[PDB]
Amino acid sequence: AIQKMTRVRVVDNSALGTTPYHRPPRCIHVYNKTGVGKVGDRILLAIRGQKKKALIVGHRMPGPRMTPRFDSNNVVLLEDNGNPVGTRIKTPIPSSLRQREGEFSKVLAIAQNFV
Amino acid sequence: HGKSVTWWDEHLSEENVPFVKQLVSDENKAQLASKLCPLKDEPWPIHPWEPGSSRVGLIALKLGMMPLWTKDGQKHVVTLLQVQDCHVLKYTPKENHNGRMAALTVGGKTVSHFHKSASILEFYQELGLPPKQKVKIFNVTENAVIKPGTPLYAAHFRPGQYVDVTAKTIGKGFQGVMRRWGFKGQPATHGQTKTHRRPGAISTGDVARVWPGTKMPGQLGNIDRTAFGLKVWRINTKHNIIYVNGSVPGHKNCLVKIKDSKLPAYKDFCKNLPFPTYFPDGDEEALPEDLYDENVCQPGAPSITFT
Amino acid sequence: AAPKNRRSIEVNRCRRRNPQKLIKVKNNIDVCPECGHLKQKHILCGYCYEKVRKETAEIRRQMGKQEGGPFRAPTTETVVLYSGETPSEQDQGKRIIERERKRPSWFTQN
Amino acid sequence: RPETRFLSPEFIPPRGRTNPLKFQIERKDMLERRKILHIPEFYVGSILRVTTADPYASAKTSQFLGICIQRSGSGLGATFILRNTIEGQGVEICFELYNPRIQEIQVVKLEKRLDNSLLYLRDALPEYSTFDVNMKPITQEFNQEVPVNQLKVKMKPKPWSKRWERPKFNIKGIRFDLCLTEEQMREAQKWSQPWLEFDMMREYDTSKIEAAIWDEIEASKNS
Amino acid sequence: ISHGRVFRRLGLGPESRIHLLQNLLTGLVRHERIEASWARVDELRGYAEKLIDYGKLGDTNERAMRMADFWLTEKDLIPKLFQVLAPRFQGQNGGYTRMLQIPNRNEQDRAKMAVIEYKGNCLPPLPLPRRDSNLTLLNQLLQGLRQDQEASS
RNA sequence: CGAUGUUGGAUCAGGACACCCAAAUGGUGCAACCGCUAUUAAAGGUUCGUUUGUUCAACGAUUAAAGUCCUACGUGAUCUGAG
Ligand SMILES: [Mg+2]
Ligand SMILES: [Mg+2]
Ligand SMILES: [Mg+2]
Ligand SMILES: [Mg+2]
Ligand SMILES: [Mg+2]
Ligand SMILES: [Mg+2]
Ligand SMILES: [Mg+2]
Ligand SMILES: [Mg+2]
Ligand SMILES: [Mg+2]
Ligand SMILES: [Mg+2]
Ligand SMILES: [Mg+2]
Ligand SMILES: [Mg+2]
Ligand SMILES: [Mg+2]
Ligand SMILES: [Mg+2]
Ligand SMILES: [Mg+2]
Ligand SMILES: [Mg+2]
Ligand SMILES: [Mg+2]
Ligand SMILES: [Mg+2]
Ligand SMILES: [Mg+2]
Ligand SMILES: [Mg+2]
Ligand SMILES: [Zn+2]
C-alpha cells in the first residue's frame, strides 16, 4: 500500500538513488486507478527536486498468502521507456514479478535475488 | 370465559414427558424412513428433458466456510450447504399459480411438533411428514414435476454447474446513515459540533418536502437477497453437502434456498443433470463419497509440480 | 422546535386511548394449590415464599448466635432441628441448630 | 520416556457456535492431506525450511528458510509465518499448511521461545531476524521435551510496530530494562486488566473435543 | 449489533461487573441462598457453577486456590468451598445450582427478582413448581397409551 | 424590517440540456491516426494536489472525461466561520 506522499527507499544503484538529499524521495502520483500502489505498479516519484518514474518492488503491507512481505517500501528508478535507470538491484524481489514479462523484462534482467 | 394460556408441556407429569418425547421422535423416524423409497411407491410419470426446462430446487443449511484449491494453483473459498431433510410438500398446477409455470413447495429441516399451529400440523398430518422449519416455492416447467412427499438429496446438483442461493441476510438492526448507505460523515476534528455521522442535508430548498426515495437511517439487513452465478465445486454424498463458490447471504446455521442459476449464460446447462431430480433408488449403483470438478485439487493427490 | 398549533382533544384522545398504550390483560394468572392465593404460572408464589423467607431468617439469626463473630463459618455441614428431635447417626458430626417451633408442615425431615 | 501427545494447533476448533459437523469434514480432509505431505511438529521460534512449487523460477522449486513468527488458523486454512533477513532486507512469508503448492516442510531446528507469538522481531536488532540460508538440520532426543530457548532480545529505539510494553501482549522475550524508563513501565501498567485471569467464564475448554479428534486421528492411521 | 455476546454489561464497566459478581458469589457461598436482580443472578449462575468445579480440583491445586482467593472475598469462606461445598457435589457433574423467579420487588423500582441457591443446602425448601400428578385425567389417558406400547411389544 | 440570519467550503444531492465522457450518425480544405464542425441521445459518470477566505484564476500530476447551468448565487432548527 504505497500511495500519495509515501516516503520510499530506492533499491537499485543509481545516480539519483544513492546520493543524499535533504528531503527523502517521495511518492507523488500512482498510475493505478485506485490511488493505491501494489507490487509491480508504476509510480511517479519526486527525487532531488525532479520527477522520475518508479516501479514498486516490495512493500510493508500484507498481501495474498505466500507472497513476500518486506520491511521497507522498495522502488526501482525507471525511465519513460520502461528501461531501468539502474545497472543492478541487490536487495531481494518478489518472484511474482516474473508473471509479467512484457513490461518488466529489462527490469527483471538486472535483478539478483528473487524471494 | 377467560380461557387461560397453555403449552404442550404444562399438564404432563414427570413420568409422561419422556414418554411423549419418545412417542413423537419415534414416529418421526418411522415417517421419514417410510418416504425414503420414492420410486417404488407411485412415482409421477418421468419426462425427458426439453430445451427450455427448469428443475426443482433445494432447501439447505449454511454450515460454515472452507478454503479449496484448484490445479492451476489458485485458492478459493467455499460455502458448505448441508441438505438436512428436504421434501416436496405440495404441487400447484400451471393455471392455478402463475398461468405460466407450475409451483412446487419444498420443506426445510425438521422442527418440533409442539411449537407449530393447528393448521400447519394438519397440513403435515395429511402428508405424513414431520413439520419443516422453512418452506419455499419453486417455479417449475410442468415436465419437471415431482410427487409431494418425495425426498430430495444433495446429489441433485452435479459438480461444475452454477446455482442461485437465496436467504435472509444478517440482521444488523436499526442503523445509521454511514453503515446503511455509505455516506461519508463530516470531518471529526476541525470544529464540527455534534455532526460527525449525521446524513447532512436531506433535500432541496425549493422542493419544500423530502422526496420518497431519500436515503435515511433505518432498518438494515433482515431481508431476502440472492447470490447468482455460483459455481458448485464439490459434492459430499454421505452427509449431503454442497460446496459452493464464495459467500452465500445469511448467517451460518441458517436455512437457505438453492436452485440452478437463472443467469443467461448458464440457461441450457440442465440437460446433463439428473432430471426430474436425483433418485438414489433407481440407478441401483452408489455414488462415490465425493464428486469433484476437474479443476479441483483433491484432499489427496500428487501435490502439484509445475513443469 | 416549537409546536405550531395546540393539539385538539380529539387528536389527543386518539393518541392516548390507542390500543397500544392500554394496559394489556395478563392471561397467565392462577391459584397456588397450597395457600389459594394468586400467582403467575412462571413465578413462585409470593405468600409461600414469604413463609419460607421468615423461617430462613430465624434459622440464620440463631445460627448467628452460634458464631461468635463475623468471620467464623463452620468447616462442616449443618442441620436444623425442632422441638422433640434428635440428630441421626447419619446427621451427627454436623453443626446443630435447635429451634423452638414445631417442625413446619412443608419442611420435611430429610 | 513418557510421551505427551502433541496436537497440531489447527485441529483445535474455534469457540463459535459453528456446527461440529463442519470441523469433522475439514479434519477428514486435512488428515487426507497429511498422508501425502508430511507436516512435522513445531512451535513458534523453531526454524523451518519450506519448499514450494513456483511456476516462474528456473527450477520449479522455491526454497525459503526462516524462523516461525506466528501460527494461526484452524481447519484447512491454517497458516504460519516465516521471518528471515536477506542482505539487510527483512522478509516475511505467510504459508498455508495445506496448500498443494507446498512440496516439503523441513524443520531445521525444533525450538520453543518464551512467547506464543513473536512478531516483535520486526522491532529487534537484525541479528535475531537473520539465519544462514544453507544451515543444516539438527537432531534431538525426545526426552529433552522440545527445549525452551530462553533468550531476551535487544530492540531498536522506539517507536515500535506495536507497543510491546503493554500488558495485553504479555512479552517476556524482550529485554525491557535496557529499552525503557521506570516511568514508562508504570505508564504501561494503567492498561492492566487483572480481573481477566480470574474470569472463569471467559476461559475456553477443550479436553473433550481433543479426546474426540485424537480418536479420529488414530482411526485415520489404521485405515 | 450485539451478535453472540455472552456477557451482559453491568455496573460501572467491565471491572465493576466482575466485582459485582464477586460480592454476589461471596454471598451465595456464605448463605447458600440469596435473592437479587434477575439479570444479575442469571449472570452469576455461570460463575457459581464453575466455582464448585474449581473446588472439586482440591485444596492442593494452586490455580484453584488463587481462583477461590480472588472470587471468595471473605477469606474464611475458602475452606468452606473446599471442605464442605465441593465434597457434597461428587456424583453430579453440573447440577449444583437452582435458580427461580421470585415475584417482583415490593419497592417502587419494581425489579425482576430471582432466588439462587446451592442444591442440598440446609434450609426450608423453596416452594418449587410441581409437575401434575399421574392420577390427573390427561396423564391417566397417557398411561393407557404406555401400557399399550408395552403390550404390543 | 412585532427578523424571509448573508460569501466560500463540508454533507447529501433534486433537476434542465444549451453533451465534457460513454453510444449512434451527416459534412469535411475526412487517405490513415488525429482533428474541426453538425444531428440524435440526459440511464450512468465528471480526479487528486500547491497558493488564495475566496467563487473565479494560475500552476503540478492525472483521467474516458475532469460539462454549462437551475434549485432562497440548493443545503447554517445538519456542520464550518477563513471572509
Ligand atoms: Mg526545487
Ligand atoms: Mg441482529
Ligand atoms: Mg471520517
Ligand atoms: Mg465553534
Ligand atoms: Mg457550541
Ligand atoms: Mg465532537
Ligand atoms: Mg411544494
Ligand atoms: Mg504501524
Ligand atoms: Mg447501567
Ligand atoms: Mg426586513
Ligand atoms: Mg411573524
Ligand atoms: Mg444529481
Ligand atoms: Mg440535444
Ligand atoms: Mg462521444
Ligand atoms: Mg447528469
Ligand atoms: Mg442571483
Ligand atoms: Mg445559498
Ligand atoms: Mg452558508
Ligand atoms: Mg447550529
Ligand atoms: Mg434550513
Ligand atoms: Zn402459595
Side-chain angles (χ1 to χ4, degrees), chain A, chain B, chain C, chain D residues 2-223, chain E:
Chain A
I2 288 175
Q3 46 171 255
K4 286 213 179 196
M5 306 268 301
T6 52
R7 295 163 292 181
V8 290
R9 167 159 161 265
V10 177
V11 161
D12 60 85
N13 48 8
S14 285
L16 288 167
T18 325
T19 187
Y21 194 77
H22 40 283
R23 311 174 99 265
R26 252 180 202 302
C27 175
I28 285 179
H29 166 259
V30 2
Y31 285 94
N32 192 19
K33 256 176 185 202
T34 293
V36 173
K38 295 293 173 152
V39 163
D41 224 327
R42 202 155 263 74
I43 257 186
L44 189 57
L45 219 55
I47 333 198
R48 323 200 82 257
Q50 66 174 21
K51 323 151 207 160
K52 202 69 191 178
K53 290 191 201 187
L55 169 69
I56 300 187
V57 159
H59 61 255
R60 310 182 71 187
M61 212 224 199
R65 301 311 128 266
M66 306 204 347
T67 279
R69 174 206 142 193
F70 294 89
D71 233 309
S72 303
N73 307 121
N74 304 326
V75 300
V76 170
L77 272 191
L78 180 77
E79 304 169 347
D80 38 324
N81 331 268
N83 311 331
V85 81
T87 293
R88 55 187 212 75
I89 298 163
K90 195 191 165 186
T91 93
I93 287 186
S95 180
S96 324
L97 267 196
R98 280 180 270 194
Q99 173 197 333
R100 321 186 209 175
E101 210 41 62
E103 328 84 305
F104 303 152
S105 183
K106 303 185 177 182
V107 191
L108 255 37
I110 75 175
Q112 305 292 335
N113 294 261
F114 284 73
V115 162
Chain B
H1 292 49
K3 293 175 191 173
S4 183
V5 76
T6 302
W7 52 107
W8 77 275
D9 229 333
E10 189 183 9
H11 298 304
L12 275 26
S13 74
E14 333 80 354
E15 170 70 19
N16 294 115
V17 180
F19 184 82
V20 160
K21 292 174 173 178
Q22 266 173 34
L23 207 43
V24 176
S25 75
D26 285 337
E27 200 192 359
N28 276 349
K29 251 173 294 183
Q31 280 191 346
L32 275 181
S34 90
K35 305 216 170 160
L36 183 70
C37 184
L39 229 20
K40 283 179 191 168
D41 206 339
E42 275 172 44
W44 284 7
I46 297 185
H47 293 245
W49 178 90
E50 311 218 334
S53 189
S54 77
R55 244 147 87 257
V56 219
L58 281 201
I59 294 191
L61 180 279
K62 188 181 181 183
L63 272 194
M65 302 185 76
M66 223 185 60
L68 158 151
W69 281 273
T70 185
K71 290 171 184 173
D72 352 332
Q74 288 136 43
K75 177 183 198 178
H76 287 357
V77 53
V78 301
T79 319
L80 312 202
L81 303 172
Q82 176 196 26
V83 174
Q84 296 210 335
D85 312 271
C86 209
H87 300 268
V88 300
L89 293 182
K90 59 180 166 188
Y91 157 73
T92 298
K94 168 185 168 188
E95 310 81 17
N96 210 345
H97 167 248
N98 186 30
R100 301 218 194 193
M101 304 174 71
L104 295 191
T105 340
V106 181
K109 81 176 195 195
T110 309
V111 291
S112 163
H113 278 84
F114 306 105
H115 299 293
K116 288 315 153 68
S117 147
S119 321
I120 309 188
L121 295 181
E122 282 176 43
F123 171 84
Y124 290 103
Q125 185 72 354
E126 301 159 357
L127 199 30
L129 283 157
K132 309 310 203 184
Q133 174 155 39
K134 151 162 303 213
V135 172
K136 294 282 174 174
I137 290 170
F138 293 84
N139 301 314
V140 148
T141 56
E142 249 178 0
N143 59 324
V145 186
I146 330 189
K147 183 185 181 189
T150 286
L152 296 168
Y153 298 97
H156 181 253
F157 308 97
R158 290 307 150 81
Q161 197 186 338
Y162 289 93
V163 304
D164 281 348
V165 170
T166 296
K168 268 179 179 303
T169 43
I170 304 166
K172 291 177 179 182
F174 191 100
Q175 281 306 319
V177 114
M178 289 186 49
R179 224 207 294 271
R180 196 200 179 171
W181 289 112
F183 293 4
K184 328 190 47 185
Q186 0 300 302
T189 297
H190 258 256
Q192 319 293 274
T193 60
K194 305 161 134 196
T195 339
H196 327 283
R197 276 192 169 264
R198 294 126 126 304
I202 71 186
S203 190
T204 321
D206 187 27
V207 175
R209 62 196 172 88
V210 358
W211 288 83
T214 294
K215 292 173 182 194
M216 265 163 45
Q219 163 71 15
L220 171 54
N222 190 2
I223 187 195
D224 296 81
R225 300 288 178 181
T226 293
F228 295 87
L230 291 193
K231 181 161 198 179
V232 7
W233 293 109
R234 171 180 161 180
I235 302 288
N236 181 280
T237 306
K238 171 141 292 172
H239 306 275
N240 287 105
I241 302 195
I242 313 165
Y243 300 45
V244 212
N245 174 78
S247 55
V248 136
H251 65 276
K252 66 182 66 188
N253 239 16
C254 86
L255 258 21
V256 127
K257 170 175 172 187
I258 341 193
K259 45 191 263 168
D260 320 343
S261 275
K262 293 298 167 181
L263 290 188
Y266 308 142
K267 188 172 180 176
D268 265 345
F269 218 99
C270 249
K271 59 174 52 188
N272 327 268
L273 288 191
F275 161 60
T277 42
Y278 170 80
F279 286 103
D281 266 344
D283 299 328
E284 301 173 333
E285 357 148 340
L287 290 196
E289 258 300 297
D290 294 76
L291 311 172
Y292 302 82
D293 188 80
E294 323 93 37
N295 295 109
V296 174
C297 308
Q298 297 209 11
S303 163
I304 52 170
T305 293
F306 295 97
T307 307
Chain C
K4 196 73 176 196
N5 291 286
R6 174 172 184 297
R7 253 142 145 207
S8 77
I9 222 287
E10 288 73 4
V11 175
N12 289 347
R13 276 204 214 87
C14 257
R15 170 175 6 102
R16 33 222 198 198
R17 287 180 191 220
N18 175 287
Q20 178 267 286
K21 292 199 175 194
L22 281 166
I23 297 169
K24 300 192 300 183
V25 182
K26 268 166 300 181
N27 50 29
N28 54 12
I29 296 165
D30 229 41
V31 274
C32 177
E34 174 69 20
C35 53
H37 286 33
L38 293 186
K39 71 185 213 50
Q40 298 203 78
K41 285 186 198 166
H42 62 286
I43 298 168
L44 289 201
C45 160
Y47 193 88
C48 292
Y49 180 69
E50 281 318 304
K51 293 182 320 189
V52 159
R53 201 51 187 82
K54 287 279 164 167
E55 196 62 17
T56 292
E58 240 39 65
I59 292 172
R60 281 169 170 174
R61 215 159 309 199
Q62 202 191 290
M63 81 187 280
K65 271 160 273 145
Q66 298 182 17
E67 298 311 320
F71 299 102
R72 277 138 58 172
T75 337
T76 57
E77 197 81 40
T78 111
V79 170
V80 38
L81 309 179
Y82 293 103
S83 300
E85 291 184 354
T86 316
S88 298
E89 180 192 351
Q90 44 148 12
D91 293 319
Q92 72 190 207
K94 296 188 194 177
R95 173 141 141 283
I96 296 180
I97 283 97
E98 300 177 2
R99 258 190 62 79
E100 274 57 29
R101 172 217 192 88
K102 300 188 170 186
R103 165 152 280 166
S105 60
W106 67 88
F107 202 172
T108 342
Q109 285 172 357
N110 310 321
Chain D
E3 296 206 345
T4 306
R5 301 163 161 182
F6 161 80
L7 190 39
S8 253
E10 351 93 13
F11 290 102
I12 301 293
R15 196 190 196 157
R17 29 182 169 157
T18 308
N19 190 338
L21 210 194
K22 184 203 152 165
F23 297 137
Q24 283 198 347
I25 297 256
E26 233 172 3
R27 263 181 280 101
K28 174 183 60 179
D29 295 349
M30 45 211 288
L31 290 181
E32 274 291 349
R33 173 60 178 181
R34 295 239 166 173
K35 289 175 181 184
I36 311 154
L37 172 60
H38 173 78
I39 281 176
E41 158 193 16
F42 73 101
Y43 304 80
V44 168
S46 51
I47 306 168
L48 315 184
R49 177 185 293 115
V50 173
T51 302
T52 325
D54 171 33
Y56 305 120
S58 49
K60 307 308 176 172
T61 251
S62 180
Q63 305 269 358
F64 182 84
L65 190 145
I67 194 170
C68 176
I69 271 188
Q70 85 173 353
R71 312 187 60 184
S72 184
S74 49
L76 234 38
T79 71
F80 61 93
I81 296 178
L82 296 194
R83 169 73 184 266
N84 186 91
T85 295
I86 305 174
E87 291 130 34
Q89 191 63 37
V91 176
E92 303 182 13
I93 331 256
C94 201
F95 301 92
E96 314 132 316
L97 278 177
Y98 295 97
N99 191 15
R101 271 157 128 285
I102 280 183
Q103 303 285 302
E104 148 188 346
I105 293 164
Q106 172 190 40
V107 183
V108 333
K109 185 175 312 181
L110 194 73
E111 194 175 301
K112 268 184 188 185
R113 293 184 68 167
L114 295 162
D115 305 314
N116 305 331
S117 165
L118 25 92
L119 292 128
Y120 51 76
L121 305 197
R122 300 193 179 98
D123 309 319
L125 305 191
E127 311 84 55
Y128 312 80
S129 287
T130 318
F131 307 92
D132 183 30
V133 212
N134 319 305
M135 73 159 59
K136 284 191 171 184
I138 308 155
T139 323
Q140 74 155 50
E141 170 212 7
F142 168 69
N143 192 253
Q144 306 297 341
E145 308 283 3
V146 197
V148 175
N149 166 24
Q150 310 181 104
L151 171 57
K152 316 272 190 163
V153 197
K154 312 276 180 191
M155 298 253 103
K156 307 177 211 174
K158 304 203 71 201
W160 298 328
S161 63
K162 299 182 175 189
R163 326 164 178 258
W164 306 114
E165 19 173 39
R166 299 288 181 98
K168 91 196 247 188
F169 286 102
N170 250 143
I171 318 190
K172 309 99 169 185
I174 320 264
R175 221 184 162 80
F176 282 132
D177 35 311
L178 313 197
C179 301
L180 310 179
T181 311
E182 182 58 36
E183 290 171 10
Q184 299 177 16
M185 295 269 70
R186 296 162 191 260
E187 272 322 291
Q189 286 307 320
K190 286 178 186 178
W191 281 261
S192 82
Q193 308 183 28
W195 61 85
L196 273 191
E197 304 176 1
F198 307 102
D199 214 335
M200 300 174 90
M201 226 75 230
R202 271 212 174 199
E203 129 239 348
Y204 187 33
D205 248 324
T206 28
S207 319
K208 288 195 177 183
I209 300 176
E210 297 213 36
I213 87 190
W214 206 278
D215 218 277
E216 184 168 328
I217 286 169
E218 297 175 349
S220 106
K221 292 170 205 164
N222 295 328
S223 66
Chain E
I1 314 157
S2 193
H3 291 176
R5 293 320 176 82
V6 192
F7 315 136
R8 67 198 68 187
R9 332 147 147 200
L10 311 184
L12 301 184
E15 181 178 31
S16 348
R17 166 213 144 94
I18 288 310
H19 288 137
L20 270 168
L21 297 177
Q22 243 193 48
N23 287 11
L24 278 181
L25 196 44
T26 297
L28 175 55
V29 167
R30 168 178 253 72
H31 304 113
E32 277 168 1
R33 178 151 67 194
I34 69 182
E35 56 195 53
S37 175
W38 189 90
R40 303 189 195 194
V41 168
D42 177 275
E43 190 63 30
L44 163 72
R45 163 171 236 181
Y47 298 82
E49 283 258 328
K50 281 216 178 169
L51 197 70
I52 297 308
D53 289 335
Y54 276 118
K56 284 183 163 195
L57 274 192
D59 234 320
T60 60
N61 191 334
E62 304 214 358
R63 273 208 54 245
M65 185 58 58
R66 63 180 180 121
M67 194 66 52
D69 178 42
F70 178 85
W71 280 100
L72 300 175
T73 283
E74 320 179 26
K75 262 52 219 168
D76 116 82
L77 286 185
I78 295 194
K80 177 180 180 183
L81 171 60
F82 288 110
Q83 301 173 41
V84 169
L85 256 34
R88 95 185 188 216
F89 302 128
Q90 220 48 83
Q92 30 180 336
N93 311 338
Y96 316 127
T97 313
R98 216 172 292 109
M99 177 196 77
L100 297 192
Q101 185 168 346
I102 245 66
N104 293 173
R105 192 149 55 186
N106 229 344
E107 307 170 348
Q108 93 149 39
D109 77 83
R110 246 75 175 75
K112 185 184 168 182
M113 287 266 129
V115 69
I116 192 196
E117 193 188 27
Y118 273 135
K119 298 210 180 200
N121 66 315
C122 39
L123 276 179
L126 252 21
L128 301 201
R130 304 194 210 113
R131 242 76 162 58
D132 258 327
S133 63
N134 253 97
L135 306 203
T136 298
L137 176 70
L138 165 75
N139 295 119
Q140 222 44 225
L141 256 45
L142 282 168
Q143 268 303 321
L145 259 185
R146 192 172 190 129
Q147 298 168 9
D148 280 30
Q149 295 310 310
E150 309 160 5
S152 299
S153 68

